[PDB]
Design a protein around this ligand. Structure first.
Ligand SMILES: NC(=O)c1ccc[n+]([C@@H]2O[C@H](COP(=O)([O-])OP(=O)(O)OC[C@H]3O[C@@H](n4cnc5c(N)ncnc54)[C@H](OP(=O)(O)O)[C@@H]3O)[C@@H](O)[C@H]2O)c1
Ligand SMILES: NC(=O)c1ccc[n+]([C@@H]2O[C@H](COP(=O)([O-])OP(=O)(O)OC[C@H]3O[C@@H](n4cnc5c(N)ncnc54)[C@H](OP(=O)(O)O)[C@@H]3O)[C@@H](O)[C@H]2O)c1
Ligand SMILES: O=C(O)c1cccc(-c2noc(-c3ccccc3F)n2)c1
Ligand SMILES: O=C(O)c1cccc(-c2noc(-c3ccccc3F)n2)c1
Lengths: 206, 206
């Protein structure tokens, strides 16, 4: 495997769990950063390496990025919609670690709202969207090989591998399953064609 | 009251650098206060005068303000996550220096958080916002002609000169390009219509 060692940030989350399971099945040697109170579930897939800590500590992010081939970022705030900088500050630490350790490839999830007319973004989701905007600027300005993944609504539909990938604009559907989103994050490790683009994965489940 | 000579504080920052560049291209005689002159670009537009020192040092601020027609303030304490007083103590020094030298016009950047509910502030930005509020009060209470510039997200989009300014709060956008923000700071030197007002610049790009 050319890319074989990967860090996943947010592996315990909705998309992270199925991304982790798919990566382990595909032969990746996965390192995760998990907060001490929220470890991976007991008998799901086991990653190769676990760092317990916080993306808001540069030291913990450095430990997680060291020695990787690539980084996948699925940070988020679960059902909490309050103002936050955890995604943007976490990305700042991830950028600094990747530069210090010679890692170039980062595939990172923000949101399709970065491609919406700003006056149409739902106000209830605007605090989170603000930090996605901050996070995207951090990653775009870093000079790293950054794939900006900007999904629409994340659902519980199957893994299909059959989704549309729209470059630098909104796509033709308004959902992507969490499993297909994770599949796409991993696909981005095997190609350079999305580097420096925004990507909107979406599908019609039928 | 033609403004020819300005001081810029914060000229090495993201907004400061493009404000300086635009000011030099437009013809202003610019004085900057920098802690490290090697953070100024060695090519292209350069300031007329460089004072090496610290905004916390009253004598360095006095040296920078002497003889100016107006002052632009683009200070920031980016890294600070917990109580900090650099911006407000700097503003106190700038105010005392402007009074001592008969400089009447100051255009200073805080943030749009000062226009929105305090609960909108991400916890890790509360300390910077608290000191923006302190700086804003220092400048409002000074009696100087003060334009308060309260931008939302500062982006990287190319200069347009086509942004909207709302004298109080809302707009097409929660983003202003750093280039457009610097353009607006300089526009405030050529008019008195924003004196004693808060301003919110924003724009929809792309
Ligand atoms: N329809 C949607 O839901 C939708 C649509 C578009 C975009 N998005 C965005 O897509 C991204 C992924 O969403 P998701 O639903 O898969 O994620 P999620 O379930 O919200 O999971 C967030 C992950 O981030 C981890 N995390 C949070 N703070 C951390 C910290 N300080 N240190 C280390 N890890 C931290 C969480 O760990 P813990 O286990 O410790 O909490 C969890 O693993 C999010 O940014 C989201 O806003 C969602
Ligand atoms: N980032 C955003 O999206 C955003 C949004 C709204 C408002 N704001 C606020 O906008 C203002 C400007 O932001 P920015 O990103 O353009 O600033 P920045 O890139 O963080 O630059 C801060 C500037 O202030 C200088 N500075 C800091 N401490 C100093 C000191 N003791 N003495 C002399 N100079 C000092 C810095 O000098 P050095 O180069 O020597 O460090 C630098 O030039 C800030 O107050 C910020 O909080 C930012
Ligand atoms: O409907 C669409 O096209 C669309 C596009 C972008 C994002 C979304 C979206 N829905 O829930 C969320 C969300 C829910 C919980 C937490 C954070 C979120 F971000 N985000 C929907
Ligand atoms: O990132 C910082 O250091 C910082 C410091 C002070 C204010 C701000 C700020 N105000 O509005 C916003 C904002 C608004 C909409 C979207 C994204 C944003 F980021 N951001 C940021």
């Amino acid at each position: 495997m050319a890319v074989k060692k990967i860090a996943i940030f947010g592996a315990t989350g909705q998309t992270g769990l199925t991304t982790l399971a798919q990566a382990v099945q595909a032969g990746y040697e996965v390192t995760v950063l998990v907060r001490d109170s929220s470890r991976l579930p007991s008998e799901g897939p086991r990653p190769a390496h676990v760092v317990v800590g916080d993306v808001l500590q540069a030291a913990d992010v450095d430990k997680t990025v060291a020695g990787q081939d690539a980084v996948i970022v699925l940070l988020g705030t679960r059902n909490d919609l309050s103002p936050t900088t955890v995604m943007s500050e976490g990305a700042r630490n991830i950028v600094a670690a990747m530069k210090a350790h010679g890692v170039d490839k980062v595939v990172a999830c923000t949101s399709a709202f970065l491609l919406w007319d700003p006056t149409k973004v739902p106000p209830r989701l605007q605090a989170v969207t603000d930090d996605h905007i901050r996070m995207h600027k951090v990653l775009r300005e870093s000079g790293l090989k950054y794939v900006a993944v900007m999904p629409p609504h994340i659902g519980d539909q199957p893994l299909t591998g059959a989704y549309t990938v729209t470059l630098d604009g909104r796509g033709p559907s308004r959902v992507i399953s969490k499993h297909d989103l994770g599949h796409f994050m991993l696909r981005c490790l095997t190609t350079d064609e999305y580097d420096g683009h925004s990507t909107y994965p979406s599908h019609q489940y039928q």
